[PDB]
Paper text:
We also crystallized the TNKS SAM domain, which again required a polymer-breaking mutation. TNKS SAM D1055RT1, equivalent to D902RT2, produced two crystal forms in space group P21, diffracting to 2.5 Å (crystal form 1) and 2.9 Å (crystal form 2), both with six molecules in distinct asymmetric units. The TNKS SAM domain was highly similar to that of TNKS2 (left). For both TNKS crystal forms, non-crystallographic and crystallographic symmetry gave rise to left-handed helical filaments established by EH-ML contacts. The repeating unit consisted of six SAM domains with pitches of 83 and 79 Å, almost twice as long as for TNKS2. Unlike for TNKS2, where protomer contacts relied on crystallographic symmetry only and were therefore uniform, the TNKS SAM EH-ML contacts varied substantially. This was apparent from the merely approximate 6-fold axial symmetry and the variable tilt and twist between adjacent SAM domains. We conjecture that the variable relative orientations of SAM domains reflect filament flexibility. However, the equivalent residues (D1059T1, K1066T1, and K1081T1, respectively) mediated binding between a subset of protomers in the TNKS SAM crystal structures. Thus, contacts not seen in all SAM-SAM pairs are still generally relevant, probably occurring in some, but not all, configurations of the flexible filament.
The poly(ADP-ribose) polymerases (PARPs) Tankyrase (TNKS and ARTD5) and Tankyrase 2 (TNKS2 and ARTD6) regulate Wnt-β-catenin signaling (Huang et al., 2009). The two Tankyrases are highly similar (Hsiao and Smith, 2008, Smith et al., 1998), sharing a set of five ankyrin repeat clusters (ARCs) for substrate binding (Guettler et al., 2011, Seimiya et al., 2004), a sterile alpha motif (SAM) domain (De Rycker and Price, 2004, De Rycker et al., 2003), and a catalytic PARP domain (Rippmann et al., 2002). Tankyrase polymerization is mediated by the SAM domain, a small helical fold highly prevalent in eukaryotes (Knight et al., 2011, Qiao and Bowie, 2005). We report crystal structures of the polymerizing TNKS and TNKS2 sterile alpha motif (SAM) domains, revealing versatile head-to-tail interactions.
Author numbering:
A (entry chain E), D (entry chain B): 1029 to 1087
B (entry chain D): 1029 to 1089
C (entry chain A): 1030 to 1089
E (entry chain C): 1025 to 1090
F (entry chain F): 1028 to 1088
The structure:
Amino acid sequence: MNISQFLKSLGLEHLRDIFETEQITLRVLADMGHEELKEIGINAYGHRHKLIKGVERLL
Amino acid sequence: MNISQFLKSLGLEHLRDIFETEQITLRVLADMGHEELKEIGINAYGHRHKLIKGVERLLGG
Amino acid sequence: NISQFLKSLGLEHLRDIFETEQITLRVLADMGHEELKEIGINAYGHRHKLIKGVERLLGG
Amino acid sequence: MNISQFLKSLGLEHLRDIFETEQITLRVLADMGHEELKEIGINAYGHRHKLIKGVERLL
Amino acid sequence: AGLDMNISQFLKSLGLEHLRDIFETEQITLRVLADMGHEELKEIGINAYGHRHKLIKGVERLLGGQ
Amino acid sequence: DMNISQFLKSLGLEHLRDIFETEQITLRVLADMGHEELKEIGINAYGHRHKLIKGVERLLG
């Protein structure tokens, strides 16, 4: 629901600072792919994969 | 339409001073991408994304 | 929106050219005299009103 | 009497869009202090000072 | 407190009659409006500071002041 | 790499002629100028700096 709650559900709460600094809401995240997520500092494929598939589960 | 109403609609009124100092009109904003917006001090991806998509919705059908 | 735009310039008769050519306000903003001649706006006066209209509307 | 004419007289015409978007009339501006003006985005003390003192004369 | 007044008449008196639909949809009476500040009014869609200011000061004058 | 007066006219920035004359900005000086350097000589609008930078880029290439 909130981006903090979304990350917690994927076990990715430790990524919270990137999302806060870049002002990424769960709605902004919905329009983001691998290239956009690499741009904001999500360097691990596994993390981007979890985020992309996580938004797909909802959206 | 004007920038002040445009920013308010996206909930980005706090960016009003950057737009005023840089004399950014909707015409200028329409040709701006992520690199151009970073140049004027819009450092958050989320803010640039909202601006870019906002102009797309505004000037599209 | 583009229909509202044309109406404001008294150019409502150009609605069909704009619809057929899929010209939105974003497309119109990047168009000059040569591009407008290409879609069939043959009168200078009409192209001038469109170009200056987008300039006034967008800031700008 | 027109907020646009008032702003012009103080050399603060650049502030017109904030006043229009926030629907601030001279009557509204008359009950506004430094805290209320900061709230609508008048971030410079000098600008708030000119506005407050400007309305004080218009009485 | 005597604020049993018609919200339609209240808005008209402030020159804010155009807000009639927000107040009707949200079922805002004068008694509800009396406990509302800038944050609560922003929440129901009253986005202009000037409009919220007029409403808050309008209820104050109807209540005596502050 | 001609007279600066012709360059500004081509971009519709002829009103900037006095800044360029007073600051003794030639096209070769302008070619090494970015957004920070142009802000320093009084070009406060992003749109004007953008037009100047991109204008010299086209001239060079």
